[PDB]
């Protein structure tokens, strides 16, 4: 149900995101009306496992601060050359 997500605080230097994307973690943002801009870290293995069950445009469960606020996926990045996810914009409902 609830998924842990460590928050990435401050400026993420390019080598930080580069050597993180070579390890299995993807940045992401969660916002809406009430909660705004918690730049957090999301795992690539569990996210695909939840998207295989709920779908691409469904409601994806995720713990924003160790709590579920029924966040919905708005858009996501993807590079066609490696089959690796890049970023998610997590609109809070």
């Amino acid at each position: 149900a609830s998924l842990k997500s460590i928050i990435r605080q401050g400026k993420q230097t390019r080598s930080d995101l580069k050597q993180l994307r070579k390890s299995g973690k993807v940045p992401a943002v969660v916002y809406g009306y009430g909660t705004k801009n918690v730049s957090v870290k999301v795992d690539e293995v569990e996210f695909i496992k939840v998207i295989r069950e709920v779908g691409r445009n469904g409601v994806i469960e995720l713990g924003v601060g160790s709590k579920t606020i029924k966040v919905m996926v708005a858009d996501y990045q993807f590079d066609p050359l490696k089959n690796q996810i890049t970023h998610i914009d997590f609109l809070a409902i």
Binding site: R56, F78, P80, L81
Partner: protein, 136 residues
Amino acid sequence: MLLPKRVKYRRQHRPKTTGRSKGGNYVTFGEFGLQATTTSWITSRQIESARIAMTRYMKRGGKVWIKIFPHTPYTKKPLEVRMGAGKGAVEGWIAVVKPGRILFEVAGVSEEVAREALRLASHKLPVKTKFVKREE
């Protein structure tokens, strides 16, 4: 084969080739597609050859889309001429295929039939390609 009915200027520069594909990376029109992983100039000759191969294999049962087009004309000179005395004369028409771009799309056949068709088409093109399907 393929070329513009009219261009405004008959003699252009050569197009840049370093970089990555800017648009057209996703299988939009059909079900399966062939994706490029190396920069090159794709002439209209090998486009029209790869299309013949891919369609003759499927026995013209499925549908095929060509996601690229030769827009830019390139020029060449006479055999023994020395350097100088103006530009060349138009020779052919090219497309620039950088890594990422989806070249051909196929729809209306099984997975293995399309995989064999897009294998036999990718032996007539000067780039290295891989088989992708519609982004789930």
